[PDB]
């Protein structure tokens, strides 16, 4: 039973996460395994394999850093899905982590 202030697509919680720098995830025990930090431009993962966040998000919004689905497998292609479309391919993920660049104001 989701509350009115929670965003779900079926079983999948949408989780917006602000980061001062994408690099702070390099020591994050949950997420470090999935990022390749040499890559430019926000990516998403097609499964939960090591360094899986490689697929380019199409036309990404300002300050989007990446999308991590914590379970399931999905169609993984470059420059095909915009952020809003990614919400429909959770395919069994329980969380969609959307990482955003923090802005000091």
């Amino acid at each position: 039973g989701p509350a009115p202030n929670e965003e779900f697509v079926g079983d999948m919680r949408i989780v917006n996460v602000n980061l001062s720098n994408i690099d702070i995830l390099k020591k994050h025990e949950t997420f470090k395994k999935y990022f390749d930090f040499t890559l430019t431009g926000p990516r998403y993962n097609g499964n939960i394999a090591e360094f899986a966040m490689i697929w380019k998000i199409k036309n990404p919004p300002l300050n989007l850093l990446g999308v991590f689905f914590d379970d399931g497998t999905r169609d993984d292609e470059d420059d095909k899905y915009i952020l809003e479309e990614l919400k429909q391919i959770g395919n069994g993920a329980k969380n969609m982590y959307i990482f955003w660049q923090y802005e000091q104001k």
Binding site: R13, V15, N18, S20, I24, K27, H28, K94, N95, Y102
Partner: protein
Amino acid sequence: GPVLEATMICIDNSEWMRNGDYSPSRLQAQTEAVNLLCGAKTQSNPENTVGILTMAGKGVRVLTTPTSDLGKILACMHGLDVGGEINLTAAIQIAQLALKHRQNKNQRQRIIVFAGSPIKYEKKALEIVGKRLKKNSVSLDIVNFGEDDDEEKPQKLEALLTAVNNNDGSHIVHVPSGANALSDVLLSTPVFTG
């Protein structure tokens, strides 16, 4: 490691987290450290649970009771308000109540307090609170960060620590101001390593 633990994290969202150390805001640096801590705790043991409350603002607020779901934890920290002063004693008592009601009673119980602002309590009041935590089997970790000009603040936090400590299960970590990143100083300490 194989330790099974329920933790309640108390965030300092007081007015002292608005001004000063920029890049990042002291509240954001705190939120990121909690993010990483919740990742460490949930990866250490999939039955661990972590909850979050904020101590200041318009009043002590429970953002989530302890859960094993990192997504619920991170989502609940979005849109934190800033202001006021921390209500340390009320926060610790609400945190203790949430841990008392943990579903899995086999979990050990721990409170983490981020103390980034003045401690407007006397040692006597803090020691009553500490001895009551000890009586209730609750361990305490204190992160002392922020401005470093009020010399009674570490002495007050040390008195609270000493009242609660049982078998050196409780800890204090002093983060020197002008630091690298809150999380970096914490990574190698018992707050993260156990």
